[PDB]
Amino acid sequence: RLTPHEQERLLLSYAAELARRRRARGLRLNHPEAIAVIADHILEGARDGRTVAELMASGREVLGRDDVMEGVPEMLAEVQVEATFPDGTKLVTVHQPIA
Amino acid sequence: RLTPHEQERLLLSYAAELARRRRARGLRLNHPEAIAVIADHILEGARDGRTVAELMASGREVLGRDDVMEGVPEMLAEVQVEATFPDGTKLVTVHQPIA
Amino acid sequence: RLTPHEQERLLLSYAAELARRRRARGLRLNHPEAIAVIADHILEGARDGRTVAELMASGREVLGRDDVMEGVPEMLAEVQVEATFPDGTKLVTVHQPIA
């Protein structure tokens, strides 16, 4: 159902699409944009059947220092997201996804 | 300004976009994803100027068994969408859409 | 994580993506779709660090009479959106965006 959690997931997903569009036209992403993009990589990766361990590593390869504004890699200590896997929902933590 | 319901409709439209994105990615759709895609087909066909009769038909040719997870086509007895027509808002029902 | 207002702004941004999709398939936009597109132009221009005056001018050149249904240009007296620039939030109004 469209629980507040489901709405929130779809919002984060569209926010990631929008942040990707911004980056693709040359902008460096700000902190919430970078979070959306990394979170969306996790969400979609889980939907593909990637494992938590795979996502913990690949979520660190999505954005680099060049992709985000000054200060963003330092402010983004980790991204934590509940993703849906084949074997249920799991919290995925990507540590230090940019630096 | 968007009403909380308008926001609901747009969220479900985006969910269908994400579903079509996943299907494009080679993923067989689950139950809610399939619903979102068929729902969206109806809403977009109504916007195009299609009749309720046309949409009940075309709605059954959006996704086949190959496009969805095993079990989904039997879970999806119907998809109902309130769609706006020049004639008014009507509930459009697509029966056994995966078939 | 998102306020009502943030949710609404993200959904209005999505509405423009949907309006672009409708246009791409050969639809002329209606009044609310046109509002979304012009609003998106402003919001994205603001994010880009364009100036209010730049956007008030370029907002008049996003959609032409061909892009919208007959009688829509006359319906669109103005499109007003709050947008956050590098120097903060401003109400931006695009006047007579089509004709």
Swiss-Prot record, chains A, B, C:
Pathway: Nitrogen metabolism; urea degradation; CO(2) and NH(3) from urea (urease route): step 1/1. It is an enzyme of class 3 (hydrolase). GO terms for molecular function: nickel cation binding; urease activity. The keyword Cell cycle does not apply. Its EC number is 3.5.1.5. One of its GO terms (cellular component) is cytoplasm. Its main location: cytoplasm. Belongs to the urease gamma subunit family. GO terms for biological process: urea catabolic process. Heterotrimer of UreA (gamma), UreB (beta) and UreC (alpha) subunits. Three heterotrimers associate to form the active enzyme. It is found in: Cytoplasm. Transmembrane segments: none annotated. It catalyses: urea + 2 H2O + H(+) = hydrogencarbonate + 2 NH4(+). Pfam families: Urease_gamma. InterPro entries: Urease_gamma (IPR012010), Urease_gamma/gamma-beta_su (IPR002026), Urease_gamma_sf (IPR036463), Urease_subunit (IPR050069). This is Urease subunit gamma. Keywords: Cytoplasm, Hydrolase. It comes from the Bacteria. Coiled coil: none annotated.
